[model samples]
Target chain A: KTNMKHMAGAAAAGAVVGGLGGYMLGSAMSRPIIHFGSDY
Target chain B: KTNMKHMAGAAAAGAVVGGLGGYMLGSAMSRPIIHFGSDY
Candidate 1:
């Protein structure tokens, strides 16, 4: 069962890390823009 | 060898699906805001 255990572990770890990374990137992409001219 | 093959398959599938789902969720979380008053 050691192989099965490792398989589950890898899948879980990959999912968690992948989700975190995607969230950070998506959040960063939508940052607000500041206008310093007539638009402001 | 079948067990090992399945293990790799599961891990790869998990990461790909996980990353796609995470990216979609994260992008949705950062949707644009609309102002309707003086602030707008």
Candidate 2:
């Protein structure tokens, strides 16, 4: 991210974006033909 | 959630959050003893 203007904001933004990715991954990467993923 | 304004949004939102968490964990769970973590 050397080509960024807002590192802090970007990091936080990235974190937010990243979190979404993780959630999906976490959801997809987990159990039972339909664990339904724990009522999240 | 027992109550909500949007499920998809919430899911997406959660994903974004989770990704960031992954990054952080990924950051912590690495090697090379000061690898700097691959330049983002």
Candidate 3:
């Protein structure tokens, strides 16, 4: 029960970390690109 | 307990679709342009 790879614990942890990292990276990269044509 | 992919699935799906579409459109619309400046 404790050594399950696809268990709730694993999924929950993965979801939290993955979501945070994805959000941070996406925002950082997309912000500049989104504003690229705004001032021109 | 059965299906838990998150309630934001629609947003995620739309983002995925929009990203792919944008990539295709941008690639197709990219081209080189010559500058026309008047100066000696």
TM-score of each: 0.17, 0.14, 0.13
TM-score (chain A) of candidate 1? 0.17
What shift in Å separates residue B20 of candidate 1 from its native position after superposition?
14
Regions of candidate 3 where Cα sits further than 4 Å from its true position: A1-40, B1-27
lDDT of 1 by residue, A1-40 (tens): 3322122223222222334334445432332222211211
Which CAPRI tier for candidate 3?
Answer: incorrect
Higher lDDT: candidate 1 or 2? 1
Q: What range of 10 consecutive residues in model 1 chain B has the weakest lDDT sum? A: B31-40
Compose the digit string of candidate 2's lDDT tens values, residues A1-40: 1332211111111122233433233222221121111222
Residue A29 alpha-carbon offset, candidate 1, angstroms: 3.8
Better of 1 and 2 by DockQ: 1
Top DockQ hit:
1
Q: Give the per-residue lDDT digits (tens) of candidate 3, residues A1-40.
A: 1321211211110011112112232221111111011111
* Chain A superposition TM-score per model: 0.17, 0.11, 0.11
DockQ of each: 0.11, 0.08, 0.02
